[PDB]
Protein backbone atom coordinates (compact mmCIF):
# COMPACT_ATOMS: atom_id res chain seq x y z
CA UNK A 1 0.00 0.00 0.00
CA UNK A 2 1.47 3.32 -1.19
CA UNK A 3 0.36 6.05 1.21
CA UNK A 4 -2.61 5.37 3.46
CA UNK A 5 -1.96 4.33 7.05
CA UNK A 6 -1.08 1.49 9.38
CA UNK A 7 -4.02 -0.47 10.81
CA UNK A 8 -4.71 -3.54 12.95
CA UNK A 9 -6.34 -6.88 12.11
CA UNK A 10 -9.21 -5.81 14.40
CA UNK A 11 -10.27 -3.25 11.79
CA UNK A 12 -9.86 -5.78 8.92
CA UNK A 13 -11.04 -9.10 10.51
CA UNK A 14 -11.63 -10.80 7.14
CA UNK A 15 -8.00 -10.38 6.04
CA UNK A 16 -5.97 -13.52 5.33
CA UNK A 17 -2.17 -13.62 5.05
CA UNK A 18 -0.88 -16.32 2.69
CA UNK A 19 2.70 -17.63 2.83
CA UNK A 20 4.68 -20.34 1.05
CA UNK A 21 7.07 -22.87 2.60
CA UNK A 22 10.51 -23.39 1.07
CA UNK A 23 13.11 -26.17 1.21
CA UNK A 24 15.06 -25.60 4.41
CA UNK A 25 12.56 -23.81 6.62
CA UNK A 26 12.28 -20.32 5.13
CA UNK A 27 8.74 -18.96 4.75
CA UNK A 28 8.01 -15.96 2.52
CA UNK A 29 4.83 -13.89 2.04
CA UNK A 30 2.93 -14.47 -1.20
CA UNK A 31 -0.43 -12.67 -1.25
CA UNK A 32 -3.41 -11.48 0.75
CA UNK A 33 -6.90 -12.94 0.76
CA UNK A 34 -10.38 -12.68 2.29
CA UNK A 35 -12.39 -15.10 4.41
CA UNK A 36 -15.76 -15.38 2.60
CA UNK A 37 -16.85 -18.29 4.80
CA UNK A 38 -15.44 -20.33 7.75
CA UNK A 39 -13.73 -22.83 5.41
CA UNK A 40 -13.01 -20.61 2.40
CA UNK A 41 -10.55 -17.89 1.45
CA UNK A 42 -10.77 -16.03 -1.85
CA UNK A 43 -7.64 -14.64 -3.54
CA UNK A 44 -6.01 -14.23 -6.97
CA UNK A 45 -4.90 -17.09 -9.27
CA UNK A 46 -1.66 -15.34 -10.40
CA UNK A 47 -0.40 -15.77 -6.82
CA UNK A 48 -0.25 -19.56 -7.13
CA UNK A 49 -0.18 -20.28 -10.88
CA UNK A 50 3.61 -20.88 -10.85
CA UNK A 51 3.55 -23.16 -7.77
CA UNK A 52 0.13 -24.94 -7.73
CA UNK A 53 1.11 -27.29 -4.87
CA UNK A 54 -1.42 -26.90 -2.00
CA UNK A 55 1.01 -28.40 0.56
CA UNK A 56 3.43 -25.45 0.35
CA UNK A 57 0.96 -22.84 1.57
CA UNK A 58 0.18 -21.57 5.05
CA UNK A 59 -2.88 -19.38 5.64
CA UNK A 60 -3.02 -17.03 8.63
CA UNK A 61 -6.15 -15.43 10.08
CA UNK A 62 -6.13 -12.84 12.88
CA UNK A 63 -2.62 -11.65 11.94
CA UNK A 64 -1.49 -7.98 12.15
CA UNK A 65 2.24 -8.41 11.52
CA UNK A 66 4.23 -9.95 8.68
CA UNK A 67 6.89 -11.78 10.71
CA UNK A 68 5.59 -12.01 14.27
CA UNK A 69 2.66 -13.54 16.17
CA UNK A 70 -0.58 -11.80 17.12
CA UNK A 71 -2.67 -12.94 20.09
CA UNK A 72 -5.75 -14.70 18.74
CA UNK A 73 -4.17 -15.64 15.37
CA UNK A 74 -4.88 -19.05 13.78
CA UNK A 75 -2.71 -21.12 11.40
CA UNK A 76 -4.26 -23.19 8.56
CA UNK A 77 -3.20 -25.68 5.86
CA UNK A 78 -4.67 -25.62 2.34
CA UNK A 79 -7.04 -28.56 1.88
CA UNK A 80 -7.96 -27.58 -1.67
CA UNK A 81 -6.42 -25.03 -4.05
CA UNK A 82 -8.79 -23.97 -6.82
CA UNK A 83 -7.45 -21.87 -9.70
CA UNK A 84 -9.55 -20.41 -12.52
CA UNK A 85 -9.14 -22.39 -15.76
CA UNK A 86 -9.49 -19.33 -18.00
CA UNK A 87 -6.76 -17.33 -16.30
CA UNK A 88 -4.42 -15.65 -18.79
CA UNK A 89 -1.90 -12.80 -18.68
CA UNK A 90 -1.43 -10.26 -21.46
CA UNK A 91 0.97 -7.29 -21.67
CA UNK A 92 -0.72 -5.61 -18.69
CA UNK A 93 -4.11 -7.26 -18.11
CA UNK A 94 -4.62 -10.36 -15.99
CA UNK A 95 -7.89 -12.06 -16.94
CA UNK A 96 -10.02 -14.16 -14.56
CA UNK A 97 -7.59 -13.48 -11.75
CA UNK A 98 -9.55 -15.19 -8.98
CA UNK A 99 -8.88 -18.24 -6.78
CA UNK A 100 -10.32 -20.18 -3.84
CA UNK A 101 -8.46 -21.86 -1.00
CA UNK A 102 -10.16 -24.35 1.27
CA UNK A 103 -8.64 -24.13 4.72
CA UNK A 104 -8.31 -26.59 7.59
CA UNK A 105 -6.36 -26.60 10.85
CA UNK A 106 -4.18 -29.48 12.07
CA UNK A 107 -7.16 -30.70 14.14
CA UNK A 108 -9.16 -30.74 10.89
CA UNK A 109 -11.37 -27.75 11.74
CA UNK A 110 -12.24 -24.53 9.91
CA UNK A 111 -12.08 -20.99 11.33
CA UNK A 112 -13.73 -20.00 14.64
CA UNK A 113 -15.16 -16.44 14.58
CA UNK A 114 -13.72 -13.87 17.00
CA UNK A 115 -12.91 -10.16 17.35
CA UNK A 116 -10.02 -10.60 14.92
CA UNK A 117 -11.54 -13.29 12.67
CA UNK A 118 -14.76 -12.57 10.76
CA UNK A 119 -16.15 -13.25 7.29
CA UNK A 120 -16.78 -10.56 4.64
CA UNK A 121 -19.96 -10.54 2.49
CA UNK A 122 -20.19 -11.23 -1.22
CA UNK A 123 -21.99 -8.89 -3.68
CA UNK A 124 -25.32 -9.66 -5.35
CA UNK A 125 -25.56 -10.73 -9.00
CA UNK A 126 -24.22 -7.78 -11.03
CA UNK A 127 -24.87 -5.30 -8.19
CA UNK A 128 -21.91 -2.96 -7.79
CA UNK A 129 -21.58 0.43 -6.05
CA UNK A 130 -22.03 3.58 -8.15
CA UNK A 131 -18.79 4.88 -9.66
CA UNK A 132 -17.26 7.66 -7.59
CA UNK A 133 -17.85 5.62 -4.44
CA UNK A 134 -15.11 5.35 -1.81
CA UNK A 135 -13.75 1.89 -0.97
CA UNK A 136 -10.87 0.54 1.12
CA UNK A 137 -7.97 -1.81 0.34
CA UNK A 138 -5.74 -3.65 2.81
CA UNK A 139 -2.38 -5.38 2.52
CA UNK A 140 1.22 -6.05 3.56
CA UNK A 141 2.59 -4.76 0.23
CA UNK A 142 5.22 -2.20 -0.78
CA UNK A 143 5.06 1.38 0.49
CA UNK A 144 7.11 2.73 -2.43
CA UNK A 145 7.94 1.25 -5.84
CA UNK A 146 11.66 1.41 -5.00
CA UNK A 147 11.28 -0.80 -1.89
CA UNK A 148 12.30 -4.48 -2.01
CA UNK A 149 11.08 -5.32 1.52
CA UNK A 150 7.52 -5.28 2.84
CA UNK A 151 6.28 -3.26 5.85
CA UNK A 152 5.98 -5.26 9.06
CA UNK A 153 2.60 -3.76 10.03
CA UNK A 154 -0.62 -4.18 8.01
CA UNK A 155 -1.71 -1.11 6.01
CA UNK A 156 -4.92 0.31 4.57
CA UNK A 157 -6.07 3.12 2.30
CA UNK A 158 -9.16 4.52 0.61
CA UNK A 159 -9.61 4.89 -3.15
CA UNK A 160 -12.44 5.90 -5.50
CA UNK A 161 -14.17 3.66 -8.02
CA UNK A 162 -13.61 4.78 -11.63
CA UNK A 163 -16.04 4.02 -14.48
CA UNK A 164 -15.27 1.65 -17.36
CA UNK A 165 -15.62 4.48 -19.90
CA UNK A 166 -12.92 6.57 -18.17
CA UNK A 167 -10.57 3.65 -17.51
CA UNK A 168 -10.87 2.70 -21.17
CA UNK A 169 -9.53 6.08 -22.38
CA UNK A 170 -6.28 6.05 -24.46
CA UNK A 171 -4.08 7.63 -21.75
CA UNK A 172 -5.48 5.17 -19.19
CA UNK A 173 -5.70 1.50 -20.18
CA UNK A 174 -7.61 1.62 -23.45
CA UNK A 175 -9.20 -1.69 -24.46
CA UNK A 176 -6.91 -3.59 -22.07
CA UNK A 177 -9.45 -3.30 -19.23
CA UNK A 178 -12.66 -5.33 -19.58
CA UNK A 179 -16.12 -5.42 -17.98
CA UNK A 180 -14.91 -8.18 -15.66
CA UNK A 181 -12.44 -5.72 -14.10
CA UNK A 182 -12.83 -2.68 -11.84
CA UNK A 183 -10.67 0.44 -11.83
CA UNK A 184 -9.98 2.32 -8.62
CA UNK A 185 -7.62 5.16 -7.81
CA UNK A 186 -7.02 8.19 -5.63
CA UNK A 187 -8.23 11.40 -7.33
CA UNK A 188 -4.81 12.93 -6.54
CA UNK A 189 -2.82 9.80 -7.53
CA UNK A 190 -1.08 9.65 -4.13
CA UNK A 191 -2.37 6.35 -2.78
CA UNK A 192 -2.76 2.92 -4.37
CA UNK A 193 -2.14 -0.79 -3.90
CA UNK A 194 1.18 -2.23 -5.19
CA UNK A 195 3.23 -5.47 -5.40
CA UNK A 196 2.70 -7.56 -2.28
CA UNK A 197 -0.97 -6.47 -2.07
CA UNK A 198 -2.33 -8.95 -4.67
CA UNK A 199 -5.22 -11.19 -3.80
CA UNK A 200 -6.29 -8.75 -1.08
CA UNK A 201 -9.76 -7.16 -0.62
CA UNK A 202 -11.27 -4.11 -2.28
CA UNK A 203 -14.08 -3.43 0.20
CA UNK A 204 -16.98 -1.06 -0.47
CA UNK A 205 -19.93 -0.10 1.73
CA UNK A 206 -22.96 -1.24 -0.28
CA UNK A 207 -26.31 -0.31 1.32
CA UNK A 208 -24.93 -0.26 4.87
CA UNK A 209 -23.12 -3.58 4.33
CA UNK A 210 -19.36 -4.13 3.92
CA UNK A 211 -18.92 -6.06 0.68
CA UNK A 212 -15.98 -7.77 -1.07
CA UNK A 213 -16.26 -5.87 -4.37
CA UNK A 214 -12.81 -6.52 -5.85
CA UNK A 215 -9.55 -8.47 -5.62
CA UNK A 216 -6.20 -6.71 -6.14
CA UNK A 217 -4.97 -7.87 -9.53
CA UNK A 218 -2.82 -5.49 -11.61
CA UNK A 219 -1.80 -2.01 -12.69
CA UNK A 220 0.86 -0.04 -14.56
CA UNK A 221 3.33 0.88 -11.82
CA UNK A 222 2.03 2.05 -8.42
CA UNK A 223 0.28 5.40 -7.84
CA UNK A 224 1.17 6.69 -11.31
CA UNK A 225 -1.03 9.45 -12.79
CA UNK A 226 -3.80 8.16 -15.10
CA UNK A 227 -2.95 4.56 -14.20
CA UNK A 228 -5.54 3.22 -11.70
CA UNK A 229 -5.36 -0.10 -9.87
CA UNK A 230 -7.31 -2.91 -11.57
CA UNK A 231 -9.46 -5.27 -9.49
CA UNK A 232 -11.22 -8.52 -10.37
CA UNK A 233 -14.96 -7.74 -10.44
CA UNK A 234 -16.21 -10.24 -7.86
CA UNK A 235 -19.90 -9.74 -8.79
CA UNK A 236 -19.29 -11.26 -12.24
CA UNK A 237 -17.92 -14.44 -10.65
CA UNK A 238 -20.72 -15.50 -8.28
CA UNK A 239 -21.64 -18.59 -10.37
CA UNK A 240 -18.03 -19.80 -10.48
CA UNK A 241 -17.65 -19.23 -6.72
CA UNK A 242 -20.83 -21.13 -5.78
CA UNK A 243 -20.04 -24.15 -7.98
CA UNK A 244 -16.56 -24.68 -6.50
CA UNK A 245 -17.53 -24.25 -2.84
CA UNK A 246 -20.21 -26.97 -2.60
CA UNK A 247 -18.57 -30.44 -2.40
C1 LIG B 1 0.17 -8.09 -6.94
O2 LIG B 1 0.87 -9.25 -7.39
C3 LIG B 1 0.29 -6.91 -7.92
C4 LIG B 1 -0.61 -5.77 -7.51
C5 LIG B 1 -0.43 -4.58 -8.43
C6 LIG B 1 -1.24 -3.44 -7.88
N7 LIG B 1 -0.97 -2.30 -8.72
C8 LIG B 1 -1.67 -1.17 -8.66
N9 LIG B 1 -1.32 -0.18 -9.49
N10 LIG B 1 -2.68 -1.00 -7.79
N11 LIG B 1 0.05 -7.38 -9.27
C12 LIG B 1 1.08 -7.59 -10.10
O13 LIG B 1 2.28 -7.34 -9.82
C14 LIG B 1 0.64 -8.18 -11.45
C15 LIG B 1 0.86 -9.67 -11.51
N16 LIG B 1 1.41 -7.58 -12.50
C17 LIG B 1 1.32 -6.29 -12.81
O18 LIG B 1 0.61 -5.48 -12.18
C19 LIG B 1 2.16 -5.82 -14.00
C20 LIG B 1 1.54 -6.06 -15.36
O21 LIG B 1 0.32 -5.32 -15.41
N22 LIG B 1 2.19 -4.39 -13.93
S23 LIG B 1 3.78 -3.66 -13.90
O24 LIG B 1 3.52 -2.00 -14.44
O25 LIG B 1 4.84 -4.41 -15.10
C26 LIG B 1 4.41 -3.95 -12.24
C27 LIG B 1 5.89 -3.66 -12.09
C28 LIG B 1 6.19 -2.22 -11.71
C29 LIG B 1 6.75 -1.36 -12.65
C30 LIG B 1 7.11 -0.07 -12.27
C31 LIG B 1 6.87 0.37 -10.98
C32 LIG B 1 6.25 -0.46 -10.05
C33 LIG B 1 5.90 -1.75 -10.42
Active site includes 226?
no
* CA 221 – CA 224 distance, rounded (Å): 6
Please tell me if the CB atom of residue 32 comes closer than 6 angstroms to any atom of ligand 1.
Answer: no
Active site includes 198?
yes
Experimental technique, in short, is: X-ray
Q: Where are the domains of the chain?
A: 1-12+120-235, 13-119+236-247
* CA 224 – CA 30 distance, rounded (Å): 24
1-12+120-235 and 13-119+236-247 share one CATH topology? Answer: yes
**Paired residues of 99 in beta bridges:** 43, 83
**Ligand 1 atom with minimal separation from the 97 CA:** 15
Please tell me if the CB atom of residue 222 comes closer than 6 angstroms to any atom of ligand 1.
Answer: yes
CA-only gyration radius of the chain, Å:
17
DSSP labels, 194-211: -TT-TT-EEEEEETTEEE
Kindly tell me the number of DSSP H helices and DSSP E strands found in the chain.
2, 15
Burial class (CB in 10 A: 0-12, 13-18, 19+), 33: buried
Which resolution, in Å, applies to this structure? 2.2
Q: Which of 34, 43, 46, 94 is catalytic?
A: 46
Mutation test residue for ligand 1: of 195, 198, 227, the one with most atoms within 8 Å of CB: 195
Among the CATH numbers 1.10.443.10, 3.40.50.720, 1.10.8.50, 2.40.10.10, which is that of 13-119+236-247?
2.40.10.10
Beta strands 155-162; 40-43: pairing state: unpaired
CATH architecture of the domain covering 1-12+120-235: Beta Barrel (2.40)
Instruction: Report the nearest-CA residue for atom 32 of ligand 1.
Output: 221
DSSP E strand stretches across the chain: 5-6, 15-21, 27-37, 40-43, 57-61, 74-83, 88-89, 94-95, 99-104, 134-139, 155-162, 181-185, 201-206, 209-218, 229-233
Please tell me if the CB atom of residue 182 comes closer than 6 angstroms to any atom of ligand 1.
Answer: no
14 and 40 Cβ atoms separated by less than 8 Å: no
Amino acid sequence: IIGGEFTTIENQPWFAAIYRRHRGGSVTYVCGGSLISPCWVISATHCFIDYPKKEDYIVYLGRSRLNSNTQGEMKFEVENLILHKDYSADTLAHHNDIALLKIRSKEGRCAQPSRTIQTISLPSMYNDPQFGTSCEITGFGKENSTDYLYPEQLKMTVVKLISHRECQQPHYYGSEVTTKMLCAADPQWKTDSCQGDSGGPLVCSLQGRMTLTGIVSWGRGCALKDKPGVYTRVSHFLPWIRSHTKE
